[PDB]
Design a binder for these strands. Structure first.
Lengths: 67, 197, 90, 80
RNA sequence: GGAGAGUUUGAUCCUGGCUCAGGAUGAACGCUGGCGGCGUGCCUAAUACAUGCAAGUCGAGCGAACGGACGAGAAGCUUGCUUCUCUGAUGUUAGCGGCGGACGGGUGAGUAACACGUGGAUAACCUACCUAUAAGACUGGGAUAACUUCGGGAAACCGUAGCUAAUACCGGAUAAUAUUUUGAACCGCAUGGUUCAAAAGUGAAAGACGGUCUUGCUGUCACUUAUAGAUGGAUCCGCGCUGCAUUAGCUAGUUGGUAAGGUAACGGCUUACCAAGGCAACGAUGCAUAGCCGACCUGAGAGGGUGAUCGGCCACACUGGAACUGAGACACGGUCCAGACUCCUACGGGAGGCAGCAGUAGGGAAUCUUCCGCAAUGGGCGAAAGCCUGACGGAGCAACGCCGCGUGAGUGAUGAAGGUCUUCGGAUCGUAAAACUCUGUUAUUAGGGAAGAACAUAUGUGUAAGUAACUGUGCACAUCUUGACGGUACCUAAUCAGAAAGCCACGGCUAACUACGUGCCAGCAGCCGCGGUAAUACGUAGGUGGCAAGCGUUAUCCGGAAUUAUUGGGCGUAAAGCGCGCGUAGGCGGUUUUUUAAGUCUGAUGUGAAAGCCCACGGCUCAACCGUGGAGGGUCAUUGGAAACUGGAAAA
């Protein structure tokens, strides 16, 4: 992170636009898949690009309106 | 989004006439799954259904509806009554409840227009709170267009806490009403419980 | 260094000045000693004012350079007629 | 930066020189006075009354102001 | 004024935790987007900063230069040029000197304590300006900047030799409660205080502008001394004010005394001596964290959390230290020193300090214009006009929030087309559309309004205090004259339904269902849990509910939580009674009588700033908002009453 610590994150959604070395924003939220994660990134505000395979919860997963 | 809806389908859901507009298909309920059996009713659905059943009446929205509700939270005597009369002592109501329309919305586009004159004064907002010791009039310029005197002529009704002068188009508010003076009567207890949780 | 003076209190466009005694060192819109009277340059022309005119003379008798915008209205109420009618009395 | 106080600088320096001359002239007068207490002629009254004039010739301007002057007179007009 | 719902098991009741629903943010992020009113906007790096302004003013105190209106003598004759002489109005600003720069604006690194709040005290204090009063306002002198002239200096700036003034500076005279010393009375909270009598002690601008004009007289302002008043400041005190005891001894100028000195004043504030006390389980100390308060959020209420904007107090100004001027500073745009940093240099040496307004980089998830104006209010100087005012008025950017209007309304069935589904008849979107008939809030145009916010000071009239004399002065009426915002808001007429709607969710908790794809894969998840070919929980469609120019998620706080339980809990077995005893400190205490009045109750006086909250009212078209006025609030001080109870004293 900015503060120079080390944590884990599950990315949500279909497709992931990311790789090694890539900047990305972070929220919090825990999932019960396991510990070793209690966060998850957000889709669309920075390098993690919005996936437009959705139309229903477009307000999330980085999507913008189709027409 | 004060009003851009069909507003009939709502009254098809609830089981009331208005609004709107007009009066077969009402025995049903909306939607594909509409006509059939559906869920039961929780207590929540009852107080809620009551709420919307008063909300789409005046076409208004919730953040205004609450603020009304808790300015009734100040004054003495019972509560729900005061919410009703203060909700129907409004400008749309004193228009249509005087008989200058066929529905409640006709009054709203009548007053955004500015056609009426609260105490002989232009006002463009239906959210005014009408009071006694007043008149109400029609911008004498415009007391003869197609809509109005088409509507004025028939005596739809009159409550005794309103006076009226069909020759003058002059109403004037008279007494503090109650539901027993205001048709389209309700239950109050259920809706006041809704603003507990 | 003590000057009865004005402390505007209204919001954006409809100001409602207050007459008040104070030492000039202070900010205007801050601290005071005692309110007296008031002012309202609109909602009626001529303005709507009150005045103590009982103890308002107290502060003059023991020291003040009352400003002109005030001095005008104190004349409009005329309490200064009593003020000089004691000061230039003797 | 500097705008106008440069006036008050020069003034501050003038009044520096003046004021210290007044004070230190007094202080030496007091030294004479207290040292005259040991003595036996007078040789005291001239000096002590003189210095007790000087306290006031120099107190009206500087920061002393009176109370401390009056303490100096209080102790010094008594020791002789 | 207060709500419960799920979840351990094959099924049950309990104890018990976790999660959800609500409200709120100085808020960011995703989606989306019409407008106005109001209010807000570096919470992080007290990190560094280019460029602009942010504090000057008085010629009616002073010397000195510029200036040239007007008047005029000769003229080279080009008969208005001009040489000088010049008469000198109006004005200017370099300088001296007086008052302000310490207020005002900005931030919260430090600070765990009289820093802050609240209530008190000062027989331990100070106080320019402004008021009121009383008295004075005499007599002398010597210099010096600007200005001339020299030199060193790259520059910064420095010195040399003359010369000039003042409300400048320096002596003398005179001057009372002001200091010492003496005595009488009076007074009290202790040191002490108030008044009277007598010996020594200090000042001032002969000033400026004006009228009468005798230049006398006297006026306005100004100066000095003194006594008050008020204002501002200071110190001391009782009380309340954070977490750890896996922080239990600390302290030697410490604690007390004597003397001296010091300070506005008291004081170990500081020196020299005598002394060994002082503080602490009622939590000393040390440790990490932090500006506080009024207030804000929440909660039915007791209570819990925070200290944004607004206002009060405090500390700080690159870090650190010291002191001058001064009424006040140990000084936010002042100095001097040392230091780090940046910069100029002829290398000798010099310059600077945005946590002022804007703005830039930097960090950060994230926080704007290098704006117009001094009309108003308040400041500072002045005799006033007037000048300066990035305070402030007020425009601009941000859906950041609150409030408000609308994106049309009435009639319109055919259940049209068209979508989806169909148990393939039909149902559904659906008066919804289409169409008919009105409107134009709002917007497009054009006019008016350029509304208020403006009261003013100076300028003429008359009127009272005082003067020998409104001649002149010090005061209430009257007219003249002043808008950055803004050609605004608002108003008036015309034009078109044409520009102006989305987000989330649909197993239950929770209002809100059907088809496809998918097949323990992609995926969701706040909980319980879905998903292995027919998923109401995944992704797609349609429809529905909620919600609205706003909506969802994330982080934080309170609620629900009776899950620190004083209101309001429990210990046989569910977590939980030490293994038991002796006894200190502390907490609790049998009965009757008498008294006391600390506790208690009651009444009053003061205070508890204002704004805010809540109630009533009035205005902005209503609301938000603003104001008014009310009630309200203390473990608060002072004081008069009651005695049953707790308490103290006494008797039984």
């Amino acid at each position: 992170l900015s503060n120079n610590i080390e944590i884990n994150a599950y990315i949500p959604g279909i497709g992931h636009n990311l790789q090694e070395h890539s900047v990305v924003l972070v929220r919090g939220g825990r999932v019960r898949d396991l510990p070793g994660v209690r966060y998850h990134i957000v889709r669309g505000a920075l390098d993690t690009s919005g996936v437009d395979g959705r139309r229903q919860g477009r307000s999330l997963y980085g999507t913008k309106k189709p027409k | 989004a004060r009003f851009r809806g069909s507003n009939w389908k709502k009254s098809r859901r609830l089981g009331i006439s208005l609004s709107g507009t007009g009066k077969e298909k009402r025995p049903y309920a909306p939607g594909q799954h509409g006509p059939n059996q559906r869920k039961k009713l929780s207590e929540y659905g009852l107080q809620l259904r009551e709420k919307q059943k008063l909300r789409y009446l005046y076409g208004m929205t919730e953040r205004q509806f609450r603020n009304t509700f808790d300015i009734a939270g100040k004054k003495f005597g019972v509560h729900g009554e005061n919410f009703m009369i203060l909700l129907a002592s409004r400008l749309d109501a004193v228009v249509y409840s005087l008989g200058l329309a066929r529905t409640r919305r006709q009054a709203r586009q009548l007053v955004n227009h500015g056609h009426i004159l609260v105490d002989g004064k232009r006002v463009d907002i239906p959210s005014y709170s009408v009071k006694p010791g007043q008149t109400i009039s029609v911008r004498e310029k415009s007391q003869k267009l197609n809509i109005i005197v088409e509507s004025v002529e028939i005596n739809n009704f009159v409550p005794e806490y309103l006076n009226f002068d069909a020759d003058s188009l002059t109403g004037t508010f008279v007494r503090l009403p109650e539901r027993s003076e205001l048709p389209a009567e309700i239950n109050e207890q259920l809706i006041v419980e809704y603003y507990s949780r | 260094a003590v000057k009865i003076r004005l402390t505007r209190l209204g919001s954006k466009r409809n100001p409602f000045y207050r007459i008040v005694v104070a030492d000039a060192r202070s900010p205007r819109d801050g601290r005071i000693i005692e309110q007296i009277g008031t002012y309202n340059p609109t909602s009626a022309n001529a303005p709507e004012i009150k005045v103590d005119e009982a103890l308002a003379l107290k502060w003059l008798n023991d020291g003040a350079k009352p400003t002109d915008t005030v001095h005008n209205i104190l004349s409009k109420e005329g309490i200064m007629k009593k003020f000089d009618e004691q000061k230039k009395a003797k | 930066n500097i705008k106008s106080a440069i006036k008050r600088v020069k003034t501050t320096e003038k009044a520096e020189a003046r004021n210290i001359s007044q004070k230190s002239a007094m202080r030496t007068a007091v030294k004479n006075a207290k040292t005259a207490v040991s003595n036996n002629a007078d040789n005291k009254n001239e000096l002590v009354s003189l210095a007790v004039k000087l306290v006031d010739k120099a107190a009206q301007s500087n920061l002393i102001h009176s109370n401390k002057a009056d303490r100096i007179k209080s102790q010094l007009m008594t020791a002789n």
